[PDB]
RNA sequence: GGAGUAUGGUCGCAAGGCUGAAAAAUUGACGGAAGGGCACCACCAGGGGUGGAGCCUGCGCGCGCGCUACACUGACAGAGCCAGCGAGUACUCCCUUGGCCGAGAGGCCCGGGUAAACUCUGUCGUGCUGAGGAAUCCCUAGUAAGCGCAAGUCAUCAGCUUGCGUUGAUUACGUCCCUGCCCUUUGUACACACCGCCCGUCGCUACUACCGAUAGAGGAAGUAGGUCUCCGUAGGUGAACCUGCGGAG
RNA sequence: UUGGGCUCUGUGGGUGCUUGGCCGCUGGCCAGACCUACUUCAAAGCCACCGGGGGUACCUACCGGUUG
């Protein structure tokens, strides 16, 4: 039996494939290859609550929408969906007789 | 396992011993495993109601491979024989020996011919 | 394969006898550690035991984790507990009747990842070898007298126990008409054990408890509307299985749905189903003198 | 042993060594550092060489027959053959030892139990 | 005498009736619509019980679970041919007329009450000599039914139960449309890829203001950029040398 | 086919792609032969495999000292 499965990270860079590669004079890759940066657009930026601006909030679609422009209807609906996410996770005689 | 979820889909089973060889059908539907259960197991998976099927062997399994024309599947068994089976009619279209046809030996440290 | 199961069987027995000897020794070992902890004097023999001191300094800490409850003791069971959703099959004796096959159906529906098989004219050691060939985790033979159930055999593979137990006071589903009863609610229920206090008691508790899918450990109390209840008085394991609805936090409304068993267990053979070379771990001992009166469990 | 007893990584190394040796084939328990302390044995490694494990598993009679047999090569291990009589055999493999593709030792067995079928 | 380990005796506390049976909560409560998976407690195809007569255990005269009768699936006669469980000095169907030998308790003797199946060949030809409705319930590969032969496993089971061998099929083996059940709309690992903020009624928490009795608890509602070298200098620890300043290459 | 067989031993080849036997070799020899000269200058370090826990009276080594 091999080992205990240990948690382990490996920090990538943003370089190209042919930059990550080993030592050759000229890659097997052509010209359409040789430019992708090892990290997707999701990696280079994720729209999220912690990176949002002040007056606005982002959706699950990834759309920053303003609390100011938002009406009470979708306000309550958004709060309802987030709550559902959480859910799935001696005195006086005058005072007495009167 | 499933490449999008990454969590364990399923244990399959039906094997007297370890599964020595693995091959998939290029259509996307049929699996074959081959093992020292003396079994060749065709695994009917991606319909709803999964099943097995045995091809019983006179011998034990060392490797399996496919035809891209996915009706045909072949088995290498350690007695040497190779066998082509029709995959739907799970039946032997042919078999042949290979012992003398690969008998090249006298490795050092052996007192055999 | 059959080789490697059989070799693991005998290996497990060998480790058990070793555990007996080392447990008798460790009875003398455990006396040291707390005596070190409290500074109180000990018996001077156990003091002047040389190998005890050397082996002590090597092997305190497993006893520490035993005290902590950290570690998982050796048995048939505790290899893969909360990992494999334990597959359970059921099959009656050689030629079942109608009510019997319906009650086996129901008890397939009571244990929730249970598949049912029908047995036909099929041979008992080959059923055992075939279940072993599908890598199960249970098998349950349930016998009949005259359109009523008799005896459940909760056997647990790869080489654990067969609890053969007579049932008493059983009445089924399929008498109550389909309008009054409903189709069963198949969810991963909870499990509640009432009154087990002897080590044999908790042994039987273990072999019942691993017939159930591992409830997801996040909100075990709130979710789930299905519970199953084993409870014993006069050694008599009695089960009632209830779907509740919870009208308040001061009142919960039950619904009796699973059947009514009161099983008395008469053997735990530490050997699987057919294996008549059995290691009799316990039995209902009638026929002796005060074995009628006194209580196991 | 030198490590203090309350150390989590100490218990992890304990269970580590004992699990790897219990699946190796040297030891007998999985619980005692003492058993590691004066149970681990060059005779235990010797007892896990492939001659003596086919003796105990009752292939041959004693380790002469076993060792000569392996020299002229009659014992497959799962799929490979065997030339080199110190192939250590773990507890997992002590079941899948068996005889080779067709040898006269296999036919000694089968000629005796009268299942000799030349096919 | 020290240390434990018990066994029961002794004493203190627990052992003083504003009493008289029938919540928490920012997380909470219940739903609905879309999306998948599953199921002989679903569809589709089929089979087969029970339910008709009787026997009868069990459950409360009723009831099902078994067993048996019911005619072409015929009989009778011959011939031919194959199994698995199976071994404790151990297993018996009764109860009686006579007689024997027993001075008596008995024992004798005679009466009365290593399959099933299959296959083949001939002899006869339907004949009180009629295969179970509504209902329901079960079942998908050695699965259903039919057949026997054995064993009797402390518990239950001879009114049977359990094994094991034999002959071995149709019909599905798709589908979530019915009934459903489960679960997605949170969390749970990132790629090329796709999608694109379900909905409801309320509750609870913060705030706003109101109402009126006699500061007040309530009722109700709403918002959350000059280096190198040379020179001329001044000072420094002086030949030199260093520093600062000013000119040249 | 005017005798033949088993079995063992012995020899040579081949079981790998065909460029000499020897020597103090740009040369000589296989019958050989010649035999003891000549001389400017020791060295740069490092590495170096003993089964584990344990003791160190004496020896070895290292380090740090001490008289001469």
**CA D79 – CA B62 distance, rounded (Å):** 8
CB C128 within 8 A of CB C274: yes
**CA D99 – CA D59 distance, rounded (Å):** 9
CA of C156 to C1' of E44 (A): 38
**CA C240 – CA B17 distance, rounded (Å):** 41
SS3 at position C170: coil
Residues belonging to chain A: 98
- Residue C250 CB closer than 7 angstroms to strand E? yes
Give chain A's largest Cα–Cα span.
Answer: 101
**CA C114 – CA C108 distance, rounded (Å):** 5
CA of B102 to C1' of F19 (A): 39
Give alpha helix (H) positions in chain C. 2-38, 44-47, 50-59, 61-68, 98-110, 124-133, 199-209
Which of D6, D34, D94 shows the shortest C-beta gap to C55? D34
- Residue C255 CB closer than 7 angstroms to strand E? no
Give the CA angle between residues D78, B101, D77 to the nearest 5°.
Answer: 10
How far are the Cα atoms of B36, C264, C283 from residue B17, in angstroms, in the given order? Answer: 6, 38, 35
**CA B75 – CA B81 distance, rounded (Å):** 8
Which one-letter DSSP state was computed for residue C250?
S
Query: By what method was this entry solved?
Result: cryo-EM
Continuous segment of H or E residues that includes residue A77: helix A72-88
Resolution of this structure in Å: 4.4
Backbone angles phi, psi at A88, to 5 degrees: -65, -30
How far are the Cα atoms of C217, C240, C246 from residue C220, in angstroms, in the given order? Answer: 6, 20, 15
**CA D91 – CA C11 distance, rounded (Å):** 10
- Residue C222 CB closer than 7 angstroms to strand E? yes
Handedness of CA B34, B37, B40, B41 (dihedral sign): negative
- Helices H / strands E in chain A, number of each: 4, 2
How many Cα neighbours within 13 Å face the side chain of D2?
0
DSSP assignment of chain D: --S-TT-HHHHHHHHHHHHHHHTTTS-S-SS-HHHHHHH--HHHHHHHSHHHHHHHTTSSSSHHHHHHHHHT--EEETTB---SS-----TTTTTTEEE-SS-HHHHHHHHHHT-----
Nearest nucleotide by C1' from A82 CA? E186
CA of C167 to C1' of E55 (A): 28
Neighbours of chain A (3+ CB pairs under 8 A): D
**CA D44 – CA D25 distance, rounded (Å):** 8
Chain D residue nearest residue B63, CA to CA: D79
Three-state SS string over chain B comes to: CCCCCCCCCCCCCCCCCCEEEEEECCCCCEEEEEECCCEEEEEECCCCCCECCEEECCCCEEEEEECCCCCEEEEEECCCCEEEEECCCCEEEEEECCCHHHCCCCCCCCCCC
**CA D103 – CA D109 distance, rounded (Å):** 10
Question: What's the distance, CA D100 to chain centroid?
Answer: 17
Give the CA angle between residues C163, C165, C171 to the nearest 5°.
Answer: 135
Q: Which two tokens stand for residue A40?
A: 């997707």
Angle between helices C61-68 and D8-22 (to 10 degrees): 110
First CA to last CA distance, chain D: 59
**If you compute the radius of gyration of chain B from its CA atoms, what whole number of angstroms results?**
16
How far are the Cα atoms of C182, C219, C220, C242, C254 from residue C225, in angstroms, in the given order? Answer: 15, 12, 11, 8, 9
Nearest nucleotide by C1' from C43 CA? E3
Residues belonging to chain B: 113
Asked if omega into C73 is within 30° of 0 (cis), the reply is no
Give chain B's largest Cα–Cα span.
Answer: 55
């Amino acid at each position: 039996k091999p080992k205990p499965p240990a948690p382990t990270l490996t920090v990538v860079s943003d370089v190209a494939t042919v930059a990550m590669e080993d030592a050759q004079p000229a890659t097997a890759q052509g010209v359409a290859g040789g430019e992708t940066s090892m990290i997707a657009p999701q990696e280079v930026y994720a729209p999220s609550k912690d990176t949002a601006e002040k007056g606005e909030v982002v959706t699950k679609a990834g759309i920053p929408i303003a609390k100011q422009e938002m009406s009470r209807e979708e306000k309550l609906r958004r709060r309802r969906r987030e709550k559902e996410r959480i859910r799935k996770a001696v005195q006086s005689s005058g005072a007495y007789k009167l | 396992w499933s490449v999008q979820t990454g969590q364990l889909l399923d244990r399959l089973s039906g094997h007297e011993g370890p599964v020595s060889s693995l091959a998939f059908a290029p259509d996307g539907s049929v699996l074959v495993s081959g093992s020292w259960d003396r079994t060749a197991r065709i695994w009917s998976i991606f319909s709803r109601t999964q099943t097995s099927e045995p091809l019983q062997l006179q011998s034990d399994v060392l490797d399996v491979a496919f035809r891209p024309d996915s009706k045909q599947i072949a088995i290498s068994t350690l007695d040497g024989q190779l066998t082509f089976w029709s995959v739907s009619e799970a039946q032997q279209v042919s078999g042949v020996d290979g012992r003398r046809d690969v008998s090249g030996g006298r490795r050092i440290t052996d007192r055999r011919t | 394969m059959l080789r490697k199961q059989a070799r693991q069987r005998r290996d497990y027995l060998y480790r058990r006898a070793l555990l007996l000897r080392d447990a008798e020794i460790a009875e003398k070992r455990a006396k040291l550690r707390a005596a070190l902890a409290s500074g109180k004097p000990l018996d001077p023999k156990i003091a002047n035991d040389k190998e005890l001191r050397k082996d002590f300094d090597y092997d305190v800490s497993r006893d520490i984790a035993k005290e902590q409850g950290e570690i998982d003791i050796d048995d048939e069971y505790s290899e893969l507990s909360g990992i494999v959703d334990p597959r359970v099959l059921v099959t009656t004796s050689r030629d079942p009747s109608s009510r019997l096959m319906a009650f086996s159906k129901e008890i397939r529906l009571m244990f929730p990842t249970a598949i049912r098989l029908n047995r036909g004219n099929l041979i008992l050691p080959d059923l055992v070898m075939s279940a072993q060939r599908e890598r199960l985790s249970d098998i349950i033979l349930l016998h009949e007298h005259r359109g009523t159930p008799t005896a459940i055999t909760i056997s647990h593979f790869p080489h654990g126990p067969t609890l053969m137990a007579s049932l008493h006071n059983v009445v089924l589903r399929a008498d109550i008409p389909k309008s009054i009863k409903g189709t069963v609610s198949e969810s991963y229920p909870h499990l509640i054990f009432e009154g087990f206090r002897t080590p044999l008691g908790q042994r039987v508790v273990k072999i019942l408890k691993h017939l159930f899918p591992p409830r997801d450990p996040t909100n075990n109390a709130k979710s789930g509307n299905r519970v199953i209840t084993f409870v014993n008085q006069d050694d008599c394991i009695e089960v009632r299985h209830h779907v509740y609805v919870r009208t308040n936090y001061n009142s919960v409304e039950l619904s009796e749905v699973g059947p009514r068993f009161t099983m008395r267990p008469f053997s735990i053979t530490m050997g699987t189903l057919e294996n008549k070379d059995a290691d009799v771990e316990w039995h209902l001992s009638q026929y002796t003198r005060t074995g009628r009166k006194k209580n196991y469990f | 042993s030198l490590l203090p007893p309350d150390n989590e990584v100490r218990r992890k190394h304990e269970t580590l060594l004992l699990d790897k040796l219990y699946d190796m084939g040297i030891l007998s328990t999985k619980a005692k550092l003492s058993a590691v302390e004066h149970n681990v044995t060059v005779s235990a490694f010797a007892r896990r060489r492939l001659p003596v494990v086919m003796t105990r598993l009752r292939m041959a009679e004693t380790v002469q027959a076993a060792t000569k047999l392996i020299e002229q090569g009659h014992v497959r291990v799962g799929v490979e053959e065997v030339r080199d009589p110190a192939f250590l055999v773990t507890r997992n493999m002590e079941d899948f030892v068996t005889w080779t593709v067709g040898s006269k030792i296999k036919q000694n067995i089968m000629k005796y139990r009268d299942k000799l079928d030349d096919f």
